[PDB]
Amino acid sequence: HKPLWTRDPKDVTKEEYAAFYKAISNDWEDPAATKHFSVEGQLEFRSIMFVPKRAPFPNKKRNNIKLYVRRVFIMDNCEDLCPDWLGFVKGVVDSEDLPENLQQNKILKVIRKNIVKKCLEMFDEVAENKEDYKQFYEQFGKNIKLGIHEDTANRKKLMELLRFYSTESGEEMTTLKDYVTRMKAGQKSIYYITGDSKKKLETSPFIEQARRRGLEVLFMTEPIDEYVMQQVKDFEDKKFACLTKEGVHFEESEEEKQQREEEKAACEKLCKTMKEVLGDKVEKVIVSERLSTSPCILVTSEFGWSAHMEQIMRNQQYMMSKKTMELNPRHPIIKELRRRVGADNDKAVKDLVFLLFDTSLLTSGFQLEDPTGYAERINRMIKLGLS
Amino acid sequence: HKPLWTRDPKDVTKEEYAAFYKAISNDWEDPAATKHFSVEGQLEFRSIMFVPKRAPFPNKKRNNIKLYVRRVFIMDNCEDLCPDWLGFVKGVVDSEDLPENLQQNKILKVIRKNIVKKCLEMFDEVAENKEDYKQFYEQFGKNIKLGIHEDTANRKKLMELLRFYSTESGEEMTTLKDYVTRMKAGQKSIYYITGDSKKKLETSPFIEQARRRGLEVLFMTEPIDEYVMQQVKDFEDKKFACLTKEGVHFEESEEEKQQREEEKAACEKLCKTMKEVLGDKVEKVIVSERLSTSPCILVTSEFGWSAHMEQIMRNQQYMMSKKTMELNPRHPIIKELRRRVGADNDKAVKDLVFLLFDTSLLTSGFQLEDPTGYAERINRMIKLGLS
Amino acid sequence: HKPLWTRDPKDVTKEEYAAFYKAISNDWEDPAATKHFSVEGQLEFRSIMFVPKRAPFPNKKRNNIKLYVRRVFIMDNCEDLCPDWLGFVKGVVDSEDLPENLQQNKILKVIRKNIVKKCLEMFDEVAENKEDYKQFYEQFGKNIKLGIHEDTANRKKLMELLRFYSTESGEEMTTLKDYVTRMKAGQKSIYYITGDSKKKLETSPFIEQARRRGLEVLFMTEPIDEYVMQQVKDFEDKKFACLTKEGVHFEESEEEKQQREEEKAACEKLCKTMKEVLGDKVEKVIVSERLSTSPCILVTSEFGWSAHMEQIMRNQQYMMSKKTMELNPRHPIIKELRRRVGADNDKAVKDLVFLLFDTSLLTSGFQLEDPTGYAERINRMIKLGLS
Amino acid sequence: HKPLWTRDPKDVTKEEYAAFYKAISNDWEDPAATKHFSVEGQLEFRSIMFVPKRAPFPNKKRNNIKLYVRRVFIMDNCEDLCPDWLGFVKGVVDSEDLPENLQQNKILKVIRKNIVKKCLEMFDEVAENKEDYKQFYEQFGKNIKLGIHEDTANRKKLMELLRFYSTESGEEMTTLKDYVTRMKAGQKSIYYITGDSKKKLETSPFIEQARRRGLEVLFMTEPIDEYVMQQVKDFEDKKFACLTKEGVHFEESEEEKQQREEEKAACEKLCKTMKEVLGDKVEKVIVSERLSTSPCILVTSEFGWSAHMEQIMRNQQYMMSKKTMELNPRHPIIKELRRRVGADNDKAVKDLVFLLFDTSLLTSGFQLEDPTGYAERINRMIKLGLS
Amino acid sequence: HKPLWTRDPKDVTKEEYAAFYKAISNDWEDPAATKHFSVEGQLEFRSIMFVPKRAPFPNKKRNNIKLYVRRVFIMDNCEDLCPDWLGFVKGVVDSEDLPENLQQNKILKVIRKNIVKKCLEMFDEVAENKEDYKQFYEQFGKNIKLGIHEDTANRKKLMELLRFYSTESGEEMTTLKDYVTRMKAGQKSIYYITGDSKKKLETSPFIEQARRRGLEVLFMTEPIDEYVMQQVKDFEDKKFACLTKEGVHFEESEEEKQQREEEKAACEKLCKTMKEVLGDKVEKVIVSERLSTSPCILVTSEFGWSAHMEQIMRNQQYMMSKKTMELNPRHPIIKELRRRVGADNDKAVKDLVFLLFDTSLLTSGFQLEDPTGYAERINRMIKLGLS
């Protein structure tokens, strides 16, 4: 009898792989996936890598990979074998030629490179089955995203393992490749928004005009998505564009251009009034091109933290964005304010402006610092309606 | 030269205590407080305990207390010396008679008892100076509260170390003893509410009628306060009463009783309508006795999780309370709804009810699951006012 | 394939339980007993607990119980799962809802409570078979007794697991329940004595009059029994009474009362002489009611350490009892001394008194500090007999 | 500034040594003794060794000696530096030429050899002051004795560090050298006995005839003395002779020889009777040459465990000795038995024999298995005397 | 089911031994050899020891042997069970009577003694098969040699496990016993040389005259052989003699004696000249008796480091030998120099002497410090030949 990793992978049964996985870990479930491989040439080694069904839980070095040299056990703690983001993989390495400090490092690097390559290969194998991938990605999506934040070397492969709900995907997640395949002729950006939940993101005001124009928007639901989007600027030559931020332009018709410029001018006074009324609470007030059904939204700066990122941070300094209010120039409420300002009906305008602002915090993904102050405006607004 | 703990405490200087504290810990600051004591009689030992200026940060046993027997070092890991909630204290114990398993346990218990006693004594010494206590309590308030949750033996002493802002304390915290001293003649309960911040709690709708009646309310701002209030039912013979919960009654005049009963009946139809309109979203709708200026609030059940507790949990099962809506029968909005229901003006009532409900979530300390749905009602309500 | 603990216990074979026990411990023997259970409701978890056939052997936390959350391994070191006295149990816990510090503690407590409950259930199952219990109790009797010394919550169940030889049990141990069933009509106390061995205890002078009266006496042979008897005052409403101590009275007839009082008075002079002769070596000399065949014994104080406890301590301060000498007023030797004192034949009385004292140390469970001094009296006593 | 060990020892003050001792250990007392030395030639190193005032308290290697190579810290765990019995010494080693496995071992051995040499030198320095040695030896006597049990290389030096009370030393301990100086002309053996305490040993029956003859006897009071006396047969060419064992002869006159032989024959019948009466309880009964004042003793075999050793073992197989009874042929009791046997007055002889036997257990350093059986004989013996 | 070690060894299958070996180690290969034994008498224990197929790889104690007492696991770290040189053996010990410090040490020693005995027995069993031994010895030859360097107690058995190529063994290794069997009538020494490789040693100049005389020479190829030969002076009463050192004499005929003495005198002038020419580079120049075909060699001192040992050390002080040049008095080159010196053709002699010296460094197992200086002499020597 001989170690399992030294056998021909076509001769090992699923049950043998499973029992060996259990022997080398604390898991009592069968592994979700297995990759048994060998590397020949400059370096020679053999290896079995496993993906568990479930994601695993200071002074402790990571011990997911047992190290053997020429079939002799060395240690279970060799961190250099495997990057932190792959820490969930359990396996063995048996190296024929590990041996003074730098020769060893070169060998460890080459081994790491190949382990990553083969793990990526394995995840791509899992992805052939939709249901299996769904379950892998629920457990290890965070890990792939971590890999993107640091393993610039495998960017494309890692990016292709990502999944996201979108405005076009329905009750299933889509891939970035398929998002790109569905892109319209002159579409330059891949649009996304971040937030707490799909339910909330799918009724988001930020995507109103994108929907009408046929621009698919990706929903990014995970705290980590925020950091990934800081490091990653594009994919298959298309830029990411966040629809909760300044700096996002839709592709416009020459006719559309003029329509927007004409609407901008008509709202200049209203914009300036709302700014003056709101003081330091916003950086500015401008005419939106993102809204259809909503009167206004609060948008974050191009380079700073988003609303969603901000509240992840408050819950858990010079990076948090000032807010920009954007107005729907076609919305009835906005139209009425423009006229009441055009004739400034001045008292009521203030109340209305703060009410729109405070409500925009709620819809734009911010918390209200002062809910009873806000309640007071709601109550006054209701009193009006009632009599 | 001899160990510092074996000297007469009246002969040791602050600088000697400080250098010894630094030698036995990783802190490079002077300790905030020092307690050097000895126990005689059944057991004999000597000890120096220190409180640090700042609160300290799986397989590791706690090592805040070095153990010596007859001046000989034994271990730094003897957990039995000191309960977990005192883990922040650094010190030494030198026992003359530690020695087979049970004789040792008895001795360890008696030593623990005395360490707790003397640490409590020390905190009470720190409390003589307001500014020093302010700083101790900011760091170790959590620890005292933890002690209350488990050290039933020292309840009173621990309870007397607590501090809270209240409706009467101003920009300073008060004690429970002083709260009790300020209590009105027939006052039975110690009133409190929990929440995110003092700023928010001081404008809370839950305390409107308590203020008018001269009932002081304590503001409890810390996640842990929630658990303390589960274990602790009273203090100096007065019950705690949470003003965000059902089951709280103010002491009433016979005249006040009748006034409330008469107001209850007049709102029965409105209450039943609002229930029918709201369906499963509330357990019931009733007439409040807590409100003065606000139209309504959402209150939690007597035995279940509070609003504040709930959102600590969502962020971090059969314990989360159903909500009860309470109405201010004297509030203009409520009066108008009563009449519009008394004559049911039926369409608009629904909108108004959900609007009041959703706003109550905001003021009663809950999150909105659906902010764009809520925005839609706000917008419709505004449209009414504008025309 | 799935973890064994997640299967229906009625479907797992003894061999499966055995192999799993071996996989999670260092034992290569089958477990003596197995308890596979689940808890539903507030908390949900599943668990397998094992009792080994043999009792197992500073910086090391106890690792008898592996912890899993939702089938994912967490740690093997979670001490909160299981009290120290159950440290011999090997098992796994798989919790569906372990998750910030206090919510976790509550869950850990509830889990501990249930583990203790189910282990106690298991020991009670083992007890259905006499031979199996005999073997369990030989290994883990010390553990049950430790549990009694600290787990006040499970007093009755733990007390019912105890076994002791008694004056009525023969070559088998009895239970406390059966002792109580055999108690005479007006019997108030459960009588016991402690000592080195059954052989020695069954010929003990302390039980002479108890035997004649039909009062069963329990023999307590283990060092730990001493501590258990300090904490535990009674069982099924009957007090424990130590027959090696002062403070023990048999239930007497009105006729028996008078007989004892009359015998007391007749021995007052002898008692006072023996005291005067013995000086500080005893607290007092009194007439016994415990003796039948022996002339005298040494008895320990009601609240202090017993003879047996004392010698456990010397071998391994203000707790060790002064001795009280009790005399058999009907014994020939005592009768002769009473007359020789009544007429004080004064020289020989001294020798006789110390001889009785030193011999009483031997029979009452004390060591002789001065065996050659004692030999000298024996030799002088022999010389008399020989001529 | 430079490491203290690299300074000239004549230039370092007691206070510098003390502070450095405290820095490298957990002791807060000044060291009792200091040895700062260097080795030159084949190997070069420097070292400071300390003896603490008090004796210090599985996976942990011993860390009493810090290791430096060329002033660079290596480890504190190098066990090879210092034998286990010197584990109480705290110090540093700074080696100029530690560097593949065997060259290092040679160097470690030579270093160990020199450390032992210099520690032995230091203990011999402490011994110049009687009071200081008294205190060292109370703490570390066990260590020197351990060294003798294994460090055959330093036998003489270690043997000269030993101290013992003796029949001639008074309230002070003596040395082996001085014992040898006091030996009589033709004295071949160094006599000793072992036991619980000096008080008991000084009234021991085993030494009665040794006292009269002017043979000094050493009192060995410590459990470890038993093992030392197993390994060590002699000192300065004189054998050790245990006076509690068979195989010990005093030097006799030709006249003394005949006297003993004549007494042997006269007691042959008594000896054989006592054997027959005692059965398996003794190996034999013989005439003693050790007794003067006592009638008899129990002696242990030449090669087996002594009485004292036996009871150390029972408290904590084929090594425990059968007992031999030796009789004082000149003792009145023995004389009377000889005559009563010479005429066998047969009933009473049995009682007397067992009484002498059981009493001999007490004086010869054994426990009584059956104290109430023994009490019964005492009582019967007393009854005789009383009438 | 019961632990494997408690079964009768004749009843356990190879597969059971293999699976148990894998369970207790990190090896996934079957063990190379197994020894399952028990010891009865004074001590009682049972044990299984394994030899792995391959040799295994600071704060870590050695854990090759699991310790059980009465079937209960104690620790895997008990170093006292097994000497460091046997550290490669994996096994279990189950002791019936391990239990205060010294009784335990005695038991541990006796256990160690028996483990070594049985491991030695096992290696001797492996040696029955040539191919199996070849493979064992390639892995663990270093270990046996380490054992010889320290386990003086098992010298003969360990020495018999050694294997070496020799001038007579061919492509196979021989044993020391067989070397001794092949020794000539009056042969006193066992001859050896050390060096880098068999290939190099078999063409060594040091063995030229030994071959002609029929004296077998052992080739010692391993760094450790150097240390073994320092500690071990002989085997089956024959001394080891190193042929690279001074102090080695062949057994000579009376006729051979005279022949050598006559050749010595004739070369005295040449020897003295070469010394004068070479200065401090050699200790002396003498006539060799070891050479046949070579003109000269460099030999090391009797007590110091050899050439091979020296270069092990340089690569990895007062121990490194000065060199002695020995000349072949019958070699043509030496003859010509003798005549050119006899007539001193003085210029060329110097060049020739250094050339012979530098070349001798190469053949005698030393490195050249100055290869371009040496190249210059080679070039000048070539220039002569070419013209």
Side-chain angles (χ1 to χ4, degrees), chain A residues 242-247 249-253:
Chain A
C242 186
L243 283 174
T244 75
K245 303 192 186 201
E246 280 201 5
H249 330 286
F250 295 144
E251 295 298 292
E252 281 185 338
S253 171

Side-chain angles (χ1 to χ4, degrees), chain A residues 66-99 101-130 132-133 136-137 139-141 143-183 185-198 200-211 213-247 249-253 255-257 260-261 265-267 270-302:
Chain A
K66 300 204 153 226
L67 172 63
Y68 286 77
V69 168
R70 263 164 267 128
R71 269 136 100 158
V72 175
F73 177 76
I74 306 301
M75 63 189 144
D76 60 353
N77 282 189
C78 187
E79 306 212 308
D80 288 351
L81 298 174
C82 205
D84 51 6
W85 67 269
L86 276 177
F88 62 93
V89 179
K90 307 285 180 281
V92 283
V93 175
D94 190 3
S95 179
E96 222 59 19
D97 38 36
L98 195 69
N101 31 327
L102 284 98
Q103 194 52 236
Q104 195 166 116
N105 284 326
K106 197 167 280 293
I107 298 172
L108 289 169
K109 280 225 222 172
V110 156
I111 292 170
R112 176 182 273 211
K113 201 170 186 179
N114 281 279
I115 285 172
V116 170
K117 190 194 180 181
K118 293 299 178 182
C119 285
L120 290 172
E121 221 172 271
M122 171 166 52
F123 307 155
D124 178 72
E125 266 145 20
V126 177
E128 326 275 12
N129 184 256
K130 250 75 165 195
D132 295 319
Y133 199 72
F136 166 89
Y137 191 81
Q139 299 297 310
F140 302 117
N143 296 89
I144 292 135
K145 278 160 214 194
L146 267 171
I148 294 157
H149 197 265
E150 71 184 59
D151 196 331
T152 345
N154 290 295
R155 183 53 55 86
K156 190 186 149 194
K157 297 175 175 183
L158 284 160
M159 290 294 281
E160 283 171 355
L161 267 7
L162 265 20
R163 297 298 184 270
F164 302 101
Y165 292 110
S166 82
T167 56
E168 299 189 24
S169 72
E171 266 45 277
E172 309 288 343
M173 296 205 187
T174 187
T175 65
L176 290 171
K177 270 174 88 179
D178 293 340
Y179 177 107
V180 168
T181 298
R182 291 182 295 271
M183 281 173 78
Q187 199 189 327
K188 285 280 187 174
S189 304
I190 297 167
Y191 295 105
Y192 70 101
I193 52 169
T194 70
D196 293 332
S197 63
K198 201 202 159 210
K200 259 195 271 201
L201 295 171
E202 69 209 6
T203 52
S204 174
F206 302 107
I207 72 188
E208 283 162 19
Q209 212 54 241
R211 271 198 201 276
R213 288 168 172 286
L215 306 170
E216 185 176 355
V217 180
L218 307 165
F219 299 146
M220 306 194 177
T221 262
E222 305 298 307
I224 198 163
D225 299 326
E226 218 66 52
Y227 292 91
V228 171
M229 293 297 127
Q230 282 181 341
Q231 258 40 118
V232 178
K233 288 86 174 182
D234 63 26
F235 174 80
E236 292 175 7
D237 267 58
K238 335 291 265 174
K239 260 103 174 212
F240 288 95
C242 186
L243 283 174
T244 75
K245 303 192 186 201
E246 280 201 5
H249 330 286
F250 295 144
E251 295 298 292
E252 281 185 338
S253 171
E255 224 275 356
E256 282 191 310
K257 209 204 222 302
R260 193 258 283 97
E261 283 160 19
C267 293
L270 176 67
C271 281
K272 226 174 175 188
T273 293
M274 283 185 84
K275 213 303 164 211
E276 211 165 3
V277 150
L278 290 168
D280 46 58
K281 296 199 166 208
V282 286
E283 204 196 37
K284 59 192 175 283
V285 189
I286 62 164
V287 165
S288 190
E289 70 154 5
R290 307 152 130 111
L291 306 173
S292 167
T293 235
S294 306
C296 55
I297 48 171
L298 293 167
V299 125
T300 259
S301 81
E302 169 176 320

Side-chain angles (χ1 to χ4, degrees), chain D residues 4 23 26 65 73 91 105 166 239 333 335 376 378:
Chain D
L4 194 71
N26 284 286
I65 294 144
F73 177 76
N105 284 326
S166 82
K239 260 103 174 212
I333 291 153
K335 285 173 168 152
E376 286 168 341
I378 287 160

